[PDB]
Design a protein around this ligand. Sequence first.
Ligand SMILES: O=C(O)CCC(=O)C(=O)O
Ligand SMILES: [Fe+2]
Length: 198
Amino acid sequence: AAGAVILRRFAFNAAEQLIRDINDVASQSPFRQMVTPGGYTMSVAMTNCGHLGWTTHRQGYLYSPIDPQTNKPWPAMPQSFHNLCQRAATAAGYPDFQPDACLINRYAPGAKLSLHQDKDEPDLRAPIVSVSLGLPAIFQFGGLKRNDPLKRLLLEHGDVVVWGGESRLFYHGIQPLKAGFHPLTIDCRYNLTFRQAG
Ligand SMILES: O=C(O)CCC(=O)C(=O)O
Ligand SMILES: [Fe+2]
């Protein structure tokens, strides 16, 4: 993964607090399985915190400062989130990265996320910070086409990946979450993706 920086277990120490704050965020903006523009309910449940929140719209996908479900602003990005992200980005070589959106994904057993690209951001030179929590998942990324040599990478609890450079444009997805158990998330996997959407 050219440009990518994988920091395994980087968020192990912050894990517990992050999970507490995810629940906090969920209290204001509950996890919901968004309906794609094509009219299909995603198996992955999501929510957002920060100034902007990624969401499905009628004309496609886009960032909005308002939660379309609660009609209220997305919850603010918790300090735990801000700190872990900055430390990660800085360690990855991006000390200037200032995210304004954190997409929180929740994966129940069997949940998956078919291949896609993240080109909804204004400046693609800005990286994306991914933090995995709970059960392990198989992350798969390819080239520039939906049908390209896909590679696999297991993301475990506390794993952080700063996607910068070329990888920032690579197709990617998550294979069906295998059943299992984790003391902090029980049978769920959470993932935080910090972005500069503004
Ligand atoms: O949970 C994952 O590792 C995938 C998250 C992702 O790429 C996204 O939702 O845009
Ligand atoms: Fe993505």
